[PDB]
Ligand binder design. Structure first.
Ligand SMILES: *Cc1c(COP(=O)(O)O)cnc(C)c1O
Ligand SMILES: *Cc1c(COP(=O)(O)O)cnc(C)c1O
Lengths: 318, 320
């Protein structure tokens, strides 16, 4: 369970922390060249920095196993299509370069990110009939924890953000994974100001959405609820629905009034970085007993169980 | 002053620049204390200004070798940094000193200048709330950018009231904080291109006018200028319009502008540093009034480029 998975990770991290490979700290792919992540440089005029005109996606590899890589690359392709972007490399070649980068980095628990930007020329002065010269950036990095393992044992502190709302879909489509974190960064600052660690943003219409890079799932009377609109369709949320269906628990991706967060039995977040992240304190008050809930634990175990299932992952050779 | 005169003098200076041997005449950038040609300027990939676009920016201008309202732009950059808990990593006068030096080295007489202040290498997510960040500074000067080409400014451009996208509300991102998160604006540009236009006008989502893809919108109706107050960036060119209009006896109202006023307006013109005053003569595939640039637009156009040579609004750059 939690102790077993975390213990094995801390052993793997000890091996990585005393490695001599300079790429063990990170590796990046820029225009066909592999460089240490610290030595990664992009053009200043790239429209992915100029106007954040890009999409991105983050797969993960745990214990040397890429977790649901097909799903993330498929979502990256869908996001590119929605923003009139093209994946600059074939999907299978992108997969192969990712395994090669991870293999050279020797990292077994890694944070992997792919970024597809508009290029050096913007959309303002664009002659119709031409397409854009989109750019591709990729890098591998040690596994990032939105919630540390020790905190996952006891649950974290969350607030319902009052000073900031989620960017509506009519402005930016949340189903397109974007790096425009204006509202999310504001939510993080508010959470820090209010003695918490995780912000939950409202839909602006008294509905729940998501937080600073994670989906929110409520548990109430044996049924799981998660917001449908205004949110990114997370892969970890997709894994939660898969695990729950195998456990006989049904998840309802529907409109969630914000009051349900205060009346819920359990609350937990989901993202590729932290994984399953239970929340035990809401608005400086414990959820129920102040401890991680039962349904949260079953989903936690199932999520990390399918990390070793060949149907959801494949092994990397070092 | 005179539209033909100003454009003629500009194109003459541009002819000198286009056949120059200086490799920096195409652009020069300041990255971590180093001066480099604009084309080969590189930033760290892990910079949180690229990772999560957690930054601010601002654009001063240099016309005919004169920095235009640099103090106003630098003050707005500091105010934007303060609002999102950022600090200008260098003293205000040193930032001014390098900017004049960069323009002088580039030999560019009509320049687009941009300053970018990013969060740094460490993000805000996993950061101890008690420590401060080592913010980064990037700046570069580039040949003057035209959101509207001079030939088109004589006759005006085509604008649409965006139907597929709304402006990001202030409750999500404060528009007074000049940001590069152009999700809605890029969507507006795509819609304008799809609808046979060049400039999108975005609504606030509440049947009110706001702004466009990097420019303020100003309507003139029955001799009075109207411009949206909330949901927009307080542009320096818009502030210059208010100064010029006040000097011309024209009344400007920074108030809430219902979208209906754009269809009932006598003249429409946009404002941004990258281009100056940009009249709009066709809105939603329909002529505005006479199909030509209006009188009030021309009076404001002349006054805007007039104060570009006024010592109260500008200062001269000593070249080599
Ligand atoms: C990608 C993303 C998610 C979902 O993360 P998965 O690991 O894909 O479940 C949630 N919120 C934001 C802002 C995201 O960008
Ligand atoms: C830069 C910008 C403007 C124009 O500001 P000036 O100081 O007038 O150039 C207007 N709206 C937005 C959104 C901008 O980014």
């Amino acid at each position: 369970t939690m102790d077993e998975i975390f213990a094995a990770y801390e052993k793997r991290q000890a091996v990585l922390e005393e490695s001599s490979n300079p790429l063990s700290k990170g590796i990046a792919w820029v225009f066909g060249e592999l460089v240490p992540l610290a030595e990664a440089r992009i053009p200043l005029m790239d429209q992915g920095f100029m106007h954040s005109d890009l999409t991105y996606d983050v797969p993960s590899v745990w214990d040397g196993r890429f977790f649901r890589l097909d799903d993330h690359i498929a979502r990256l392709e869908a996001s590119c299509a929605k923003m009139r972007l093209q994946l600059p490399l074939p999907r299978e070649e992108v997969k192969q370069i990712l395994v090669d980068m991870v293999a050279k980095s020797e990292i077994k628990d890694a944070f992997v990110e792919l970024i597809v930007t508009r290029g050096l020329k913007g959309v303002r002065g664009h002659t119709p009939g031409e397409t854009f010269k989109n750019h591709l950036y990729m890098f591998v990095q040690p596994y990032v924890w939105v919630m540390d393992p020790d905190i996952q044992k006891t649950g974290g502190k969350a607030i319902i953000a009052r000073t900031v709302r989620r960017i509506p879909p009519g402005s930016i489509d949340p189903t397109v994974k974007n790096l425009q974190w204006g509202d999310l960064t504001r939510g993080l600052f508010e959470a820090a100001d209010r003695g918490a660690t995780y912000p939950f943003l409202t839909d602006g219409d008294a509905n729940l959405t998501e937080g600073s890079g994670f989906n929110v799932l409520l548990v109430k009377d044996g049924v799981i609820y998660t917001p449908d609109r205004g949110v990114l369709q997370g892969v970890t949320r997709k894994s939660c629905i898969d695990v729950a269906k195998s456990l006989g628990i049904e998840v309802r991706v529907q409109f969630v009034p914000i009051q349900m967060a205060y009346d819920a039995d359990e609350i937990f977040m989901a993202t590729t970085a932290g994984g399953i992240m239970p929340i035990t304190t809401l608005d400086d008050k414990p959820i129920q007993s102040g401890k991680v809930g039962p349904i949260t634990k079953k989903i936690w175990d199932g999520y990390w169980a399918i990390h070793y299932d060949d149907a959801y992952s494949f092994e990397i050779q070092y």
